[PDB]
Amino acid sequence: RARFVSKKGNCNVAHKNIREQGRFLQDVFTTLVDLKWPHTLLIFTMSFLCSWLLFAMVWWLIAFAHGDLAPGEGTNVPCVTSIHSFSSAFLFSIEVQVTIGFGGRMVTEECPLAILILIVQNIVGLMINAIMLGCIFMKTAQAHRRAETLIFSKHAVITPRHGRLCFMLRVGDLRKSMIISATIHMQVVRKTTSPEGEVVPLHQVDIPMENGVGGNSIFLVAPLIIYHVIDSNSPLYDLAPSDLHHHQDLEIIVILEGVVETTGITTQARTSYLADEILWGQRFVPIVAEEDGRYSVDYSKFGNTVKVPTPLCTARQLDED
Amino acid sequence: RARFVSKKGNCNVAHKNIREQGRFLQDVFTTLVDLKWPHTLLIFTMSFLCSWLLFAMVWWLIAFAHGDLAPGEGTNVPCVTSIHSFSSAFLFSIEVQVTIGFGGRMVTEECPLAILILIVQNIVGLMINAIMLGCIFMKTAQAHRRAETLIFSKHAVITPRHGRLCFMLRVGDLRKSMIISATIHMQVVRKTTSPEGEVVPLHQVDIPMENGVGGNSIFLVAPLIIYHVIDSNSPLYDLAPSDLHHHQDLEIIVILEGVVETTGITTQARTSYLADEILWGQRFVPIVAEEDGRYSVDYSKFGNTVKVPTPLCTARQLDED
Amino acid sequence: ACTKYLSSAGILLLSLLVFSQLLKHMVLVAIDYWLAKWTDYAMVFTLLCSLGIVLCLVTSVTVEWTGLKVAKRLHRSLLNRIILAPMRFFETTPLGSILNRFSSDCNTIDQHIPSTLECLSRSTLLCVSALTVISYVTPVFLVALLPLAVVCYFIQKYFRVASRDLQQLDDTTQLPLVSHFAETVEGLTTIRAFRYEARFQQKLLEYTDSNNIASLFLTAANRWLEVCMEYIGACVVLIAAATSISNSLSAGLVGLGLTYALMVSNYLNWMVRNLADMEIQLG
Amino acid sequence: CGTENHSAAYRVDQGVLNNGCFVDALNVVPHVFLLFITFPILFIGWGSQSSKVHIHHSTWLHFPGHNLRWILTFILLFVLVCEIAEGILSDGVTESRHLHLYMPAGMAFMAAITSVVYYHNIETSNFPKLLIALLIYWTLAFITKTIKFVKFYDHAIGFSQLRFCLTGLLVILYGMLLLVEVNVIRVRRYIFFKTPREVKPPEDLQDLGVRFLQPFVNLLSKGTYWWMNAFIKTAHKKPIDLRAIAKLPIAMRALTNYQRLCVAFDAARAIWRALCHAFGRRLILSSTFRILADLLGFAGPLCIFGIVDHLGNAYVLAVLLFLALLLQRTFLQASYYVAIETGINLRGAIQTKIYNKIMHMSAGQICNLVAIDTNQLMWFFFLCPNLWTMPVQIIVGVILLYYILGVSALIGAAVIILLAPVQYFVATKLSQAQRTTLEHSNERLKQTNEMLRGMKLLKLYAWESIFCSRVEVTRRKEMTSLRAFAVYTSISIFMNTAIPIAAVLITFVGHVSFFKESDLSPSVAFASLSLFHILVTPLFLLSSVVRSTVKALVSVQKLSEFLS
Ligand SMILES: COc1ccc(Cl)cc1C(=O)NCCc1ccc(S(=O)(=O)NC(=O)NC2CCCCC2)cc1
Ligand SMILES: Nc1ncnc2c1ncn2[C@@H]1O[C@H](COP(=O)(O)OP(=O)(O)OP(=O)(O)O)[C@@H](O)[C@H]1O
Ligand SMILES: Nc1ncnc2c1ncn2[C@@H]1O[C@H](COP(=O)(O)OP(=O)(O)OP(=O)(O)O)[C@@H](O)[C@H]1O
């Protein structure tokens, strides 16, 4: 009785024997963006800290090689001014990569090497900031947060409309902003067997949206009733009004794609309906009311369904008679 | 026996007599992003180095024109303080573009020209950083790395399903993250001749996905079996069960498009199947198993196919009888 | 409830046993204590010889006498209680459920329970003595001792669960092998002329493998618990040595502490293993 | 680095001037660089294991020649801890602190653990474009300690220059382990055109789900059973079923072990030789680990002796004792876990062989043969390592006991010589009473079966009392046998408790009363005591080993009979 995907999508599938070739880590940036915020912050905190520290040791050493640190004498000229301890060297490293340049610690012309190190450190730190920014930008574009604003009624009903038995489901959007080119796809997950004896554990069947023009798009502003009319080509043509719910173990996958009008990022709203989450002989209660100046949506009535007289047979039997 | 595209896509086609108009280089930024990381780094290392250096020479010269460098006398006032050698001038250049400003080297009001040079150098260096960042961002968006995470079975089989002879192929995704609006296109590359005597060296034929709603989209979470039912309109209607594999030299092109849920970047997964990579009379072994709490995918069984009794004739002959 | 064994034992021999065990263990502690007060001539050495005579067999003889008492009492009691019961309780229940108890449980009680309870109690009082002496030498050792005791508690619980499961599963696993084996001998010519022996090769392979993976896990489990129990013993060796030398900076207290710090690694293993075994065998 | 202004007076004096404190800062470099370059990489892996690790339980491979990598890391950590001790001893002048004379080493220790967890993560998921940093780090650290060692030889005093010897030791350590990964380069050759490397048998072994995946893990697990940890939490959570339990790995087959046994046969002088030729290679490793565990056990009271010597060089002995105990325990477990595996595979292959002999017959005795003697083999094999090991522990304990105590070592030697054949004798009379108890138990249980099956007919006649009196008769005969058991068990536990008392008592007293030139320091006494705590186990295990080898001769004799 395992679900393919949860009520909130979040597909629950294990993947055994991945022959990892290391491609998992090669894709460093999709991974970084995929990370939770606390880890993105730790990595960049660590990267900066390490970069500042790794270079700082080099600066301290160059001071040491020159031997300028303990003489503290005027005649000798240091490569990096005001360098008395590692700590002084560390602070110098910080001032270089984050471009502070306090000035109490300056680079002289004594060490042609110090000049080279300065060039390298600036560039390395520079590239790090470039990469870090790129990563942060993509994270701020994680539109999946908008996917959480999309609503799917907990249960979908089966009722006749225009004399035809159909599958109904309510969907909505809580934000004022729109989702452009909102497209809905519906698949039926069913362990199926062909006549050739072939067995499929999770066969996915495409379900038409009864769109008037055969399209999959929908202008969703107010909660809408998405439905599928069951016909000779629908896998639900043989649904039993009583056993389909509990003894059969099927799952309806509802996918809502589209782009956020604000970012341009394509997202997905995923949900599922097990056999026991579907109601037979019930329909949805109207949600939209009307004020003198506008239309109003009552979201507390989303899961509100009522029992209506309905034929208690399979769609096939209904058509046969 | 040359392949159009490799098993891993990477289309292998030479392009002779390009009448290059220079548009190849005009598109500097698509090119920069296209470059491998080591070269992107070298270019920007070089660009900074050059920019820092080119300007540094100018700074040294302005010191020279003023003649402030060798007098080292107090009465005279330098345009740029602490300038004794080119090296001192170089370090000054660095401190300006990467905005360090150590302070040991400052710009005075003596040279109205030095002031102008400072303005120019800041802006030039500023624009460079802007362009450099832009380039780095697009590189961090190179979602082709996700294309490498997509799997295509090495060989595709030909077996009957529901009594109809069909072409089967397994496809998967190794990452937890999804690919939105995943669309599959299938083309047949065949040197073909019309009745008018016209000859085409690489004619591409469109192949339907047997989608229940006539769509090309697929919600791929678990490995799926993509197939094409051979009919009167399919170019495989006359396939010979034995000679189609070796004496005929056809190629099946499989394209998997879609956008990465994390970046919003559209990518492609490209693969091909030569005649000898197709099996006749074999099907795929089930991959998905089931644990008490979830569904499990065994990826080590991807290329696992078994022999099943099948008609040994062309799809046409099968239909004729 | 393990106390039913105690009620079948009688309180008097319990008192004899526990008082004699505490007697000989505190005698061992006192031997090492006056050894320390020695080493930091006739007097305390004659005291040590007089101490070392005191340790005696009485706990062992008390254990064995008590086991004989429990055996004859439970045997007579279950015999008379079952022959009191009507024929209907024999008819509803399987006779194998009675006779398997009669054979296995009596052989368990009369062969393995008494000695293993004695060694479990002995190892228990030995680790108590070791911790007591190490705490007596190094008083601030207890701060380090506490979370290690917590970790030993957690490991202890997890091991006991996994060990009961694997042990019972191994004991059930080995039996259809010898069952199939005896069958395969009894119908040998039948299978040969049937020419089905490849099938029963395969079945014996399945049974044999099963007995292996069952045994392997049991062995692996035992090793895992044993390995962890020693790491903690090595840690308390380190901490006791550091604290003792830090405070010393007398000799005898430190040397006793290190001796018992050595012994505690074997003590933990012995106690846990015997605990899980007795938790099985009191069923 | 120092007290006065000398840290600079290095470079104030001209040229290189051999750079005394400076080479320590050069050795800082490799270690600090390593941590920093790899922190970003290691961290993403750590975050990925927190995010999505269901894929991580699917993929496993070993780089070629990696066991020696593990053990070289272990012993270099050992010597690093030793040079940390040398650095603290050198700073023990304490006129001022000398950070650069022990901290560099400490950073190496930190670096070493990272340098091996990084290797564990590249071995976790194959990405050979990632140990480039690793090998350049090893060659750079090798170069820096090489410079340190040659300047040490430039300022040499020679043999007792302790840091010199230790330094060159870990120099050639890094050099040889550096050669290890270029052997890995020679294998995989990823910088030139190819790497076709993949394991099927652990990967296809993984197909059934739950695993006894020990044969393929890191050597850390192979000492500590790290893999087991994950498995037990489930058993605490949910109950355990046979389906949940694993299926043995590719090499672990009754078929495969039987096949190698058949190869051994194809190759007194027959079956025994085949068994050795089939399992000797596997067995001798357990023996070796057991021998090393013996040496590390004898290191214990030596450390006690030195500690109570200096308390009459202290924490260093404790730390070395700590490492010795860890490796000892681990070595003992390794020997234990290999003895077992050999036993098991022997049981499966021998059962298969017996079965095929039955299949070639062109019966309760045969069931007894399998159900007894194969189990005896399994057990004997576990205690097979001890056949020559027991002589070592006892003898080397005697040698150190003499080097501590002088003439009184023969007292405790007399105690243990009086110990062992007493155990043998009591085991003999135990087995006699076992056979008596088996006879009485068979009588009682068979009569009990007849009574329980006819218990209805006894209920018809109220004839239960007569046959319960029969039960009582056979039960009293059983109680006679059980009193014999009580006798023999009490005498065994009295031996195993009272022997360590008498040994210590008579040894110290005969020492001191034998000559008034005795000197009963705690360093003598307690080291001898802990030796006596060691040497109970070998004797008490050796008596059972002797009886086991008698039973072993019997098992081979009966199998020789049946395989005829
Ligand atoms: C543990 O005493 C000793 C003391 C000292 C010496 Cl030098 C050797 C031993 C010793 O024992 N050497 C045999 C090696 C050994 C025996 C038992 C155990 S164990 O922890 O009881 N685990 C199991 O027996 N598993 C069973 C074994 C039989 C098949 C089915 C699984 C672990 C290892
Ligand atoms: N070989 C080539 N490589 C790249 N671009 C080309 C090439 N040949 C033509 N083009 C550009 O693309 C167009 C292709 O059209 P076509 O080849 O018919 O040109 P055309 O009719 O020969 O006229 P033209 O002489 O301008 O090419 C041309 O107008 C030209 O601008
Ligand atoms: N278990 C797996 N996990 C990840 N990637 C895989 C896995 N198995 C195969 N691949 C990659 O994807 C492709 C899947 O094809 P398939 O499983 O048919 O491979 P194959 O025919 O067994 O050949 P190969 O032995 O190269 O896998 C393989 O070519 C392989 O490169």
Author numbering:
A (entry chain A), B (entry chain B): 32 to 352
C (entry chain E): 1000 to 1039, 1064 to 1272, 1277 to 1310
D (entry chain E): 6 to 272, 284 to 328, 354 to 403, 414 to 615
Quote what the paper states about this structure:
ATP-sensitive potassium (KATP) channels are unique hetero-octameric complexes each composed of four inwardly rectifying Kir6 channel subunits and four sulfonylurea receptor (SUR) subunits belonging to the ATP binding cassette (ABC) transporter protein family. In pancreatic β-cells, KATP channels formed by Kir6.2 and SUR1 are gated by intracellular ATP and ADP, with ATP inhibiting channel activity while Mg2+-complexed ATP and ADP stimulating channel activity. During glucose stimulation, the intracellular ATP to ADP ratio increases following glucose metabolism, which favors channel closure by ATP, resulting in membrane depolarization, Ca2+ influx, and exocytosis of insulin granules. All sulfonylureas stimulate insulin secretion to reduce plasma glucose levels by inhibiting the activity of β-cell KATP channels.
To obtain a structure of KATP channels bound to GBC and ATP, channels comprising a rat Kir6.2 and FLAG-tagged hamster SUR1 (96% and 95% sequence identity to human sequences, respectively) were expressed in rat insulinoma INS-1 832/13 cells, affinity purified, and imaged in the presence of 1 mM ATP (no Mg2+) and 1 µM GBC. Particles from this class were further classified and refined using Frealign, which yielded a map with improved resolution of 3.63 Å. In our new structure, constrictions in the selectivity filter (T130), bundle crossing (F168), and the G-loop (G295, I296) are clearly seen to indicate a closed pore. SUR1 is found in an ‘inward-facing’ conformation, with NBDs clearly separated and the vestibule formed by TMD1/TMD2 open towards the cytoplasm. We have previously reported the location of the ATP-binding site at the interface of the cytoplasmic N- and C-terminal domains from two adjacent subunits, giving four equivalent sites for the Kir6.2 tetramer. The pocket itself is formed by the overlap of three distinct cytoplasmic structures: an N-terminal peptide (binding residues N48 and R50; subunit A) immediately before the Kir channel ‘slide helix’; a C-terminal β-sheet (I182 and K185; subunit B) immediately following the TMD-CTD tether helix; and a short, solvent-exposed helical segment (Y330, F333, G334; subunit B). The α- phosphate of ATP is coordinated by the main-chain nitrogen of G334 and K185, while the β- and γ-phosphates are coordinated by side-chain nitrogens of K185 and R50, respectively. In the current reconstruction we find well defined, non-protein density within the TMDs of SUR1, with a size and shape which closely matches that of a GBC molecule. A primary anchor is composed of two arginine residues, R1246 and R1300, which coordinate each oxygen of the sulfonyl group. Each nitrogen of the urea moiety is coordinated by T1242 and N1245, and the adjacent benzene and cyclohexyl groups (adjacent to the sulfonyl and urea groups, respectively) are stabilized by a series of hydrophobic interactions contributed by TM helices from both TMD1 (TM6, 7, 8) and TMD2 (TM16).
